[PDB]
Ligand binder design. Structure first.
Ligand SMILES: OCc1cnc(N2CCOCC2)s1
Ligand SMILES: [Cl-]
Ligand SMILES: [Cl-]
Lengths: 301, 301
């Protein structure tokens, strides 16, 4: 039946994307009810970016300093404030395409869909995990800033990410929709590096369950193991520790397949020590860690 | 930077998806203007699966046998005709969400986005390529039939795929939106199997050019090759023959990076001989063949 990195359908979010301009800087905003959300760094000249005083730069600004474009319509900005690293532009018009939504903050290891934008114009959608080091491995060029991450639960869009910057290594850093950074990052032109990342162990196991469900069974074995024995291997390979809670979340997949988590940890232990003996799993030569147990259950059942 | 299997924003396709029911069979239809397109096999029962006489099964149907449903709204069917393997249900309402669109037949190697859908509700979006053996490696469960593949260039949706069936090896077969199958396949449950699959050589080369644009150079070598020597090597690894057409298509990525097409071909021959020696290219430990030369520029420069 097959297994693919799958994004949520993006239409409910496409209806919310606008172009925000302040001086020379144009980038993407999120228009929900009568507010446009975008990165506060939209107000900064290149010179400001080196050591910005947002407080001071913003009082110096007025409503008319902000051009908001929803397709071929100018919105009138009637107010401006800041919450953490996010700029809120109050507009005269409630977005008639506002979906059922909430602002949510996600945990490392959780996945979400990204609508990549360019002049308030949506261009692509991809799935990605919040890394243990609080970065994401996006695909962004200039103009992507204010591109947004989301999940959909029934009809409700849960917004969890707004893109702020690229780090030197090609990875991306951003905020929740309340403007709190994911990770130890600041919105200033300064020296910042991604911390050393780790592998999301519970997601690798979920993806091994997806492989078995799809008839990729070769890596299975008669053996089992313990959390403690496994976690001494994981810690060795820069794998996150597996907790009792991770084992409980993989419950449904363990039932559906007949392979218990420490059963499957034994398989993963051997893959870490011995490698893949030149094979693939679901058409990958890497151990994939950007599918959650929920993602595997949603896609396979 | 970053390099991601990115799907087109799905919103313009989401507003076209409906549920078609006939007898005890429910699947997806595509509602454009006053027509719903779906697989003709919606009109089959149990003993119509091996040798359906579609002309005989359809003449016995009236408009009211077809229950079409857009969210909660029932659409009234006022007409029906068959075009190749696609059924066309005429309805009394034109879809107010109809985007600018066209129907295109794609060739092997081309990529598109798939909007996977169940009971006319979109569930996810992913990027595919038409394999050289005219199948797609999708993610499709029971009820996905009538899910569509598409590109979006400058606000115009080009429909290129409609999902009909899963073959014994877990890969997928379907039609263009004129009802003609890709490959030698038929909408009958008689034994059928895909041709042996090959790697899309032109796409792999485009992806090596993207790796060089994004700063990877470790796999380059001082060698060149003749086109003919390259094909004699590449076919021993089940790679598609590279043609002069393919060489012309890579010209711009050649010019951008200053590496001739037959120099990059020498690099590919070396990678097939050596593998990757614990390294990765753009985040993969395999040579990726689902990015086209056109996609590589859409996502790079
Ligand atoms: O219940 C019997 C079936 C199971 N899976 C099916 N699908 C898989 C691929 O998409 C079309 C057919 S029919
Ligand atoms: Cl400050
Ligand atoms: Cl094509």
């Amino acid at each position: 039946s097959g297994f693919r990195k799958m994004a949520f359908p993006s239409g409910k979010v496409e209806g919310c994307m606008v172009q925000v301009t302040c001086g020379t800087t144009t980038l993407n905003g999120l228009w929900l009810d009568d507010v446009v959300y975008c990165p506060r760094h939209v107000i900064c000249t290149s010179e400001d970016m080196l050591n910005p005083n947002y407080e001071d730069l913003l009082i110096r600004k007025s409503n008319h300093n902000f051009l908001v474009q929803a397709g071929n319509v100018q919105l009138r900005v009637i107010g401006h404030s800041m919450q953490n690293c996010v700029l809120k532009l109050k507009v005269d018009t409630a977005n008639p395409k506002t979906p059922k939504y909430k602002f949510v903050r996600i945990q490392p290891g959780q996945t979400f869909s990204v609508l990549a934008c360019y002049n308030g114009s949506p261009s692509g959608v991809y799935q990605c995990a919040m890394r243990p080091n609080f970065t994401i491995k996006g695909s962004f060029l200039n103009g992507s800033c204010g591109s947004v991450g989301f999940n959909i639960d029934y009809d409700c869009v849960s917004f969890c990410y707004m893109h702020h910057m690229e780090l030197p290594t090609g990875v991306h850093a951003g905020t929740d929709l309340e403007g709190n950074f994911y990770g130890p990052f600041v919105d200033r032109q300064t020296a910042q590096a991604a911390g050393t990342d780790t592998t999301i162990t519970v997601n690798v196991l979920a993806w091994l369950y997806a492989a078995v469900i799809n008839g990729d069974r070769w890596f299975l074995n008669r053996f089992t193991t313990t959390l403690n024995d496994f976690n001494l291997v994981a810690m060795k390979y820069n794998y996150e520790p597996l907790t009792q809670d991770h084992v409980d979340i993989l419950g449904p997949l363990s039932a559906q397949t007949g392979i218990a988590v420490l059963d499957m940890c034994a398989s993963l232990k051997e893959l870490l020590q011995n490698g893949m003996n030149g094979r693939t799993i679901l058409g990958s030569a890497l151990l994939e860690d950007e599918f959650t147990p929920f993602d595997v259950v949603r896609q396979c059942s």
